Amino acid sequence: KPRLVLKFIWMEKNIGLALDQTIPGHGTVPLSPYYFWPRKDAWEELKVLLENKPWISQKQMIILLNQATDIINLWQQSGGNLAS
Amino acid sequence: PEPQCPPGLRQYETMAVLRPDMTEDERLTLTQKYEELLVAGGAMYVEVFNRGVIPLAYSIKRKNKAGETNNYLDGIYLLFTYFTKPESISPLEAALVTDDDVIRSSSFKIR
Amino acid sequence: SARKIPKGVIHVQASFNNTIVTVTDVRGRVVSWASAGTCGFRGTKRGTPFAAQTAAGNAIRTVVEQGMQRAEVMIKGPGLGRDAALRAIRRSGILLSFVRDVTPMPHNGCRPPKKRRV
Amino acid sequence: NEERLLNRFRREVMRAGVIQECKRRRYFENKQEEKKRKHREAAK
Amino acid sequence: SVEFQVFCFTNKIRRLTLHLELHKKDYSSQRGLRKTLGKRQRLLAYLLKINGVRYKELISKL
Amino acid sequence: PIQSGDRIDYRNMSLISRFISEQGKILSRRVNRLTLKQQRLITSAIKQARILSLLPFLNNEKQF
RNA sequence: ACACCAACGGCGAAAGCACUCUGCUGGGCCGACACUGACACUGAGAGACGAAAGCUAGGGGAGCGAAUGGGAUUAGAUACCCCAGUAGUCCUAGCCGUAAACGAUGGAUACUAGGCGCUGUGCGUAUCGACCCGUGCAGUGUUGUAGCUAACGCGUUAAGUAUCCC
């Protein structure tokens, strides 16, 4: 079981959260799924994809979700203000 | 060792949860009603072993005989890996509903 | 007055056309409630995020006789009144321990009524 | 505290869209195939 | 083996009938009883088609 | 994976609770990645353990 | 009444059937020759079952809700919207026997490319144990050759080629 990377991007309007996932005991190829500019859910889409995998351990899913959460959180604050 | 007797009749396993308070007449009297089952069943009645008391999820509604008092969070987890005729299981259900120290008794039929 | 303990639950009945911001202690004796119909305007205006913000602000501005530090919020229901209410409580910024949902999730209990066809 | 919202973000795990679903009437497989076909294809 | 089919279906109808008459509303096993009656009945017309005396013995046995 | 030879019963609370969420609800076959048979058998077993109050019917929501 | 499980999923002859457990009991599928030796198919009239609404008799009645009543919109509103709300909905014992009771496709057998699937079992590989690959069948689905079709399409589960029966 390889281990993992969320990649975020912040531009003022729009978050992207990108989940790159990895192999269980069964050889698999994930992408990085990038979740998108419209208000359509990023955390639900990401976490659900991970749960749908089961190929991801709980520690792995959670660490990536915590990082994802943190960025959505920073993003909400910057959007409500102007940080940039 | 268990597939010796099931030419003739069936195999079950009853899960029954208990009160958390009493430690006496709990291994004793419920084994005496297990002897009432022995008058009923009379087969390889073994492995009536006990499981430790742990906090369950949510339980209300003891229904004592005119008590209707106690909420619960804990319970002693008995399970009887018994073995009987398919006749007279409903009286085991009535015996494991009506008695006080047995609440929420679900029997099963392992294969 | 009250028991004078600065920890206590907050419930937000966010309806589909209203909000109610009530605040009560651990036992459940309410110390104040203030809704969108409480804070003045009433009609199609009530139940919008400005009504959630104003109703939450006028709800918990009157607990300064207590000055509750350890807040915890237990919201309920669908509507446009949740997120503005949480931004109002975080605007007052008191020690919000955890927000939570206690919405009734039925297990096919009663038949919900006719579809609207409007 | 910061102005981050994880209750909305966590809320879409088990969405409040099971409550906008349950306001209107119990109706059979025509609108359960519309809502649950669009929902079985929204998660795939 | 034919008379084990007729006799076996006869005990099938005995045990299923003393099931059904003290029960009275299972409308699923009614088809099982009627498929058994028809299946046995085509067997009895078969063995009657073959023989006389031997089918007379099948009647006299039950 | 995780079949582990021994059959799934309500007494086996190890592989069970890997299948429910912390919210306490049953996950589907395409998430848990089992066969249909494993899915139905843990379904009946999980609902049995739901009767014995080994598992909550609802877990109270939490933050922070 | 039974959320998530719920799946383009399983079962039933159809209607239907999902909270769990037990009891009785139907039906299906697969293997070995273990047995009988054509006992097969269809089926007039007949008989059974047959969603929902309906009716008789007795219970029960939380939600929903024909009729009804009030408010609104409206020129008007017996309607869509809203608030109350009776029969009904549920159960016992019956009657009724109709539905877009739809796959808009009666049943049965034999034969005629493939690809991608799912479900159940069987064999071999691999390990010696869960996998995993091919397969033998049965069932369920999706694209599709030939052929048919007025066309759309159907296409081994034919609307193909033939035979039988209503």
UniProtKB/Swiss-Prot annotation, chain B:
Transmembrane segments: none annotated. Signal peptide: none annotated. This is Small ribosomal subunit protein bS6c epsilon. It comes from Spinacia oleracea. The lineage of its organism: Eukaryota, Viridiplantae, Streptophyta, Embryophyta, Tracheophyta.
Curated annotation (Swiss-Prot), chain C:
The keyword Ribonucleoprotein applies. GO terms for cellular component: chloroplast; ribonucleoprotein complex; ribosome. GO terms for molecular function: rRNA binding; structural constituent of ribosome. Signal peptide: none annotated. The keyword Hydrolase does not apply. Keywords: Chloroplast, Plastid, Ribonucleoprotein, Ribosomal protein, RNA-binding, rRNA-binding. One of its GO terms (biological process) is translation. Component of the chloroplast small ribosomal subunit (SSU). Mature 70S chloroplast ribosomes of higher plants consist of a small (30S) and a large (50S) subunit. The 30S small subunit contains 1 molecule of ribosomal RNA (16S rRNA) and 24 different proteins. The 50S large subunit contains 3 rRNA molecules (23S, 5S and 4.5S rRNA) and 33 different proteins. uS11c interacts with bS21c. Belongs to the universal ribosomal protein uS11 family. Component of the chloroplast ribosome (chloro-ribosome), a dedicated translation machinery responsible for the synthesis of chloroplast genome-encoded proteins, including proteins of the transcription and translation machinery and components of the photosynthetic apparatus. NCBIfam families: PRK05309.1, uS11_bact. This is Small ribosomal subunit protein uS11c. It comes from Spinacia oleracea.
From Swiss-Prot, chain D:
It comes from the Eukaryota. It is found in: Plastid, Chloroplast. Belongs to the bacterial ribosomal protein bS21 family. Component of the chloroplast ribosome (chloro-ribosome), a dedicated translation machinery responsible for the synthesis of chloroplast genome-encoded proteins, including proteins of the transcription and translation machinery and components of the photosynthetic apparatus. Component of the chloroplast small ribosomal subunit (SSU). Mature 70S chloroplast ribosomes of higher plants consist of a small (30S) and a large (50S) subunit. The 30S small subunit contains 1 molecule of ribosomal RNA (16S rRNA) and 24 different proteins. The 50S large subunit contains 3 rRNA molecules (23S, 5S and 4.5S rRNA) and 33 different proteins. bS21c binds directly to 16S ribosomal RNA. This is Small ribosomal subunit protein bS21c. The gene is rps21.
UniProtKB/Swiss-Prot annotation, chain E:
Transmembrane segments: none annotated. GO terms for molecular function: structural constituent of ribosome. It comes from the Eukaryota. It is found in: Plastid, Chloroplast. One of its GO terms (biological process) is translation. Keywords: Chloroplast, Plastid, Ribonucleoprotein, Ribosomal protein. GO terms for cellular component: chloroplast; ribonucleoprotein complex; ribosome. Disulfide bonds: none annotated. Belongs to the universal ribosomal protein uS15 family. Component of the chloroplast small ribosomal subunit (SSU). Mature 70S chloroplast ribosomes of higher plants consist of a small (30S) and a large (50S) subunit. The 30S small subunit contains 1 molecule of ribosomal RNA (16S rRNA) and 24 different proteins. The 50S large subunit contains 3 rRNA molecules (23S, 5S and 4.5S rRNA) and 33 different proteins. Component of the chloroplast ribosome (chloro-ribosome), a dedicated translation machinery responsible for the synthesis of chloroplast genome-encoded proteins, including proteins of the transcription and translation machinery and components of the photosynthetic apparatus. This is Small ribosomal subunit protein uS15c. It comes from Spinacia oleracea. The lineage of its organism: Eukaryota, Viridiplantae, Streptophyta, Embryophyta, Tracheophyta. The chain holds residues 21 to 82 of 90 of the full protein.
